[PDB]
Each structure stands twice: as structure tokens, then as C-alpha cells.
PDB file of C-alpha atoms in Angstrom:
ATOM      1  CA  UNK R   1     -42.963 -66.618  44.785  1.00  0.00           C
ATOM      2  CA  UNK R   2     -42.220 -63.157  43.526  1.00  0.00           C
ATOM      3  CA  UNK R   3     -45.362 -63.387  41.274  1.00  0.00           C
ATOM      4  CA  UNK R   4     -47.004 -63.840  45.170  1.00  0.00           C
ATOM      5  CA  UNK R   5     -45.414 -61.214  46.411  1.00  0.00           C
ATOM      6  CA  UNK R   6     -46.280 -58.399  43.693  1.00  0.00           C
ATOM      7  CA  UNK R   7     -49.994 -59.544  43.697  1.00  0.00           C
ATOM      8  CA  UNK R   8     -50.059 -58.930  47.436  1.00  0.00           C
ATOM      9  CA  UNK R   9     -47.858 -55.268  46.951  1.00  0.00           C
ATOM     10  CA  UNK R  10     -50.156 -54.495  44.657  1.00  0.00           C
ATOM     11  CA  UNK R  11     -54.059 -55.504  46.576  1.00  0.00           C
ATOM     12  CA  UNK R  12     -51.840 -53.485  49.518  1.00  0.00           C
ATOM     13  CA  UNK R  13     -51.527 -50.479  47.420  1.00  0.00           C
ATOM     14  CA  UNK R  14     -55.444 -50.547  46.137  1.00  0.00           C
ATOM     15  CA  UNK R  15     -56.622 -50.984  49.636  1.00  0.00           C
ATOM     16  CA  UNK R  16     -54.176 -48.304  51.713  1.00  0.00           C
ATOM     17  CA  UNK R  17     -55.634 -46.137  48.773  1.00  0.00           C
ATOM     18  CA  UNK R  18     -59.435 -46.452  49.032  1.00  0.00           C
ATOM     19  CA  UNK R  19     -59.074 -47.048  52.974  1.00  0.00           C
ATOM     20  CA  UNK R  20     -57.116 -43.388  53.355  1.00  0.00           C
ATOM     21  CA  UNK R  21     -60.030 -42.070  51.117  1.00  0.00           C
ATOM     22  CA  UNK R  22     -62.305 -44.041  54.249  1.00  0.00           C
ATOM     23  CA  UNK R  23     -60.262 -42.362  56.973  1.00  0.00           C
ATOM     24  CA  UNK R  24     -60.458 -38.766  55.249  1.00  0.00           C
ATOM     25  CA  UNK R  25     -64.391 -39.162  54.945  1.00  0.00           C
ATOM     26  CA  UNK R  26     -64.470 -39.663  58.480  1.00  0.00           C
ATOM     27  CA  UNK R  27     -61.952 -36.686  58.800  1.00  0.00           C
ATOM     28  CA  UNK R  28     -64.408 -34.881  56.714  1.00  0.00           C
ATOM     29  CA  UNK R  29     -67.459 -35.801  59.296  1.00  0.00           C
ATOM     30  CA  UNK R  30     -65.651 -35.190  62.605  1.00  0.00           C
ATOM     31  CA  UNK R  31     -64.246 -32.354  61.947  1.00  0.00           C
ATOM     32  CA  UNK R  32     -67.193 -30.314  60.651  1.00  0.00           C
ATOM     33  CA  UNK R  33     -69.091 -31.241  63.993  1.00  0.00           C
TER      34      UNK R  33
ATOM     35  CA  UNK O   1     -32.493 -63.467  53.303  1.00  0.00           C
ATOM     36  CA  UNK O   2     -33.197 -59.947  51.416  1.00  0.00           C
ATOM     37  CA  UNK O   3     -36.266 -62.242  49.917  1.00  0.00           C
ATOM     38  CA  UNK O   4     -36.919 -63.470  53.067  1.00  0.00           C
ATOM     39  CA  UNK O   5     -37.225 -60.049  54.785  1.00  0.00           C
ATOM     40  CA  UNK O   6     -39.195 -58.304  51.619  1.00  0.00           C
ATOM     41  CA  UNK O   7     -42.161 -61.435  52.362  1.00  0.00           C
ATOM     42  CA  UNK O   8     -42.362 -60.497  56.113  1.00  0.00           C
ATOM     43  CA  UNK O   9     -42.906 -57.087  55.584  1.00  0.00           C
ATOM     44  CA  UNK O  10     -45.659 -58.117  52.944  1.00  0.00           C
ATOM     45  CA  UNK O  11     -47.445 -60.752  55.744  1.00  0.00           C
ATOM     46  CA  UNK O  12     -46.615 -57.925  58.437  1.00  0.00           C
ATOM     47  CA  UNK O  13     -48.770 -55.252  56.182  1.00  0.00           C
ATOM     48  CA  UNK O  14     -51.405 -57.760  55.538  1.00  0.00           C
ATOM     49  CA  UNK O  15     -52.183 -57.963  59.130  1.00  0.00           C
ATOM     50  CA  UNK O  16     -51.766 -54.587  59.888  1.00  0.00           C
ATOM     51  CA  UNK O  17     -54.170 -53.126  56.812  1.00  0.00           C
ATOM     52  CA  UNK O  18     -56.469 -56.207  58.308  1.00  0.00           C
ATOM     53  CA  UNK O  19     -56.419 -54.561  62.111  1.00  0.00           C
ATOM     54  CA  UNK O  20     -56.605 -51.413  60.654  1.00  0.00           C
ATOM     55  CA  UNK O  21     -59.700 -51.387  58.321  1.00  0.00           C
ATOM     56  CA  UNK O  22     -61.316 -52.976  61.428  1.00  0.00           C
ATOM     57  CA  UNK O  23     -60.642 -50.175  63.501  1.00  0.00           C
ATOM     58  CA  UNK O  24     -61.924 -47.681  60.595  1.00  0.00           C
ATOM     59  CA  UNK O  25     -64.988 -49.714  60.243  1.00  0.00           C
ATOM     60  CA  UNK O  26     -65.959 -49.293  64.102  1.00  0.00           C
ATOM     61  CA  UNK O  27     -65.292 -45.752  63.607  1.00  0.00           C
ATOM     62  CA  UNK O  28     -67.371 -45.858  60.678  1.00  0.00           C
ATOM     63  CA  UNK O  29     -70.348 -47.587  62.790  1.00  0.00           C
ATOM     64  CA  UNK O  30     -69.687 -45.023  65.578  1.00  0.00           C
ATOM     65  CA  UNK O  31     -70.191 -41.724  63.646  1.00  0.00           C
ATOM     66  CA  UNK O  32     -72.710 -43.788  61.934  1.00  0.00           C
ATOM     67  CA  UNK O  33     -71.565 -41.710  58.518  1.00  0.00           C
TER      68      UNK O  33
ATOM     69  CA  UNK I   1     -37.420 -57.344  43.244  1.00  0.00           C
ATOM     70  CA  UNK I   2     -36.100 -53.473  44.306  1.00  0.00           C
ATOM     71  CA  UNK I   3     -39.185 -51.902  43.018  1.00  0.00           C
ATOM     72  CA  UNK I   4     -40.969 -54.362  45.402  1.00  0.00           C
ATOM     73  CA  UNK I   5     -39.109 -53.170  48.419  1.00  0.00           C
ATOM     74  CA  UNK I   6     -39.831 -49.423  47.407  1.00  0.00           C
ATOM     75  CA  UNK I   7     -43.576 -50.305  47.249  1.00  0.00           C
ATOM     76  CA  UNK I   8     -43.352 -51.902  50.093  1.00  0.00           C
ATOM     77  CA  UNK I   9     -41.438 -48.922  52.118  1.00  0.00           C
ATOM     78  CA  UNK I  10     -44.180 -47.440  50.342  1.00  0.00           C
ATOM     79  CA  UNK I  11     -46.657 -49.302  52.133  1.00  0.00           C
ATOM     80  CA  UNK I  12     -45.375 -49.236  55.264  1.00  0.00           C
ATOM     81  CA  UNK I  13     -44.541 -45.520  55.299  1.00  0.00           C
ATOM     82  CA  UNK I  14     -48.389 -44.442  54.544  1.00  0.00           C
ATOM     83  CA  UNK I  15     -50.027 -47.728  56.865  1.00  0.00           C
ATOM     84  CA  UNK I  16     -47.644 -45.581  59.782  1.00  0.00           C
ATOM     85  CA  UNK I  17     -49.482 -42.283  58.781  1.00  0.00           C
ATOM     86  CA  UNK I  18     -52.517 -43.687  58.082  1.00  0.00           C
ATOM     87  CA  UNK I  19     -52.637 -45.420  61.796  1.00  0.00           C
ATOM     88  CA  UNK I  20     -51.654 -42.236  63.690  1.00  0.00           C
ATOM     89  CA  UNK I  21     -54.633 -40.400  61.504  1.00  0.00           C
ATOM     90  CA  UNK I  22     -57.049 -43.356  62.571  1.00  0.00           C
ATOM     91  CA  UNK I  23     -55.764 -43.045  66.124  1.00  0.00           C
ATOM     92  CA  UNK I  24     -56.450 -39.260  66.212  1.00  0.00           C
ATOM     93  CA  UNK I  25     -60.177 -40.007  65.056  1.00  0.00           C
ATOM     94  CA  UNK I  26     -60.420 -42.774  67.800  1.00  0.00           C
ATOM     95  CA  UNK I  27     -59.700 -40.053  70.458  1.00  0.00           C
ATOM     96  CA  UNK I  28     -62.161 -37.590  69.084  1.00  0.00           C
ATOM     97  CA  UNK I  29     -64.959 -40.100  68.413  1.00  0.00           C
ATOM     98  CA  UNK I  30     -63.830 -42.029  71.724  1.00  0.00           C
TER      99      UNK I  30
END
């Protein structure tokens, strides 16, 4: 149940990572228009 | 319950990272970089 | 069980920044 809980903390913390890196890509794009 | 609470937040930020890589991905698909 | 909650106050701290950065691009894109 806690074993549950830090497995799904932890795919959280990967994704929020590589999705900012997403979002400031896009940042990236936009804002050199 | 303190464990109680510490599992909805988990679920809640499940959904939201769901919802929210959606909303990058159309973004993605719009600027088409 | 503590570190969990600070990961997740973690997590929920940068998924609020995060959204308000997506929202900004949805304005300029939109």
C-alpha cells in the first residue's frame, strides 16, 4: 500500500520532469516566433 | 486518515498529469513542433 | 511515509506551475 504509493510518487516525478522539458520546448518555439 | 489523504493527492495528480499531458500534446500538434 | 508527502507537495507545487505555464502557451497558440 505504501510500496503503491512510492511507485506512483515516483512515475509522477519522471513524468512532471520530462513533460516540463515538453512545455519549455514549446516555450522555446512560441516565443522565438 | 493522514494515509488516507497522502493516496488522494497521489490519484488527484494522476489525473491531473493525465489532463495535462493531453493539453501539451494538442499544443504540440498545433505548433506542429 | 513524510518523505512521501514532501514529494508529493512536491508534485503538486510544480503540476500548479507547470499548468499556469501550459495555460499561458494555450493563449498564445489559441
Amino acid at each position: 500500500r505504501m510500496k503503491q504509493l512510492e511507485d506512483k510518487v515516483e512515475e509522477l516525478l519522471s513524468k512532471n520532469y520530462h513533460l516540463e522539458n515538453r512545455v519549455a520546448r514549446l516555450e522555446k518555439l512560441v516565443g522565438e516566433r
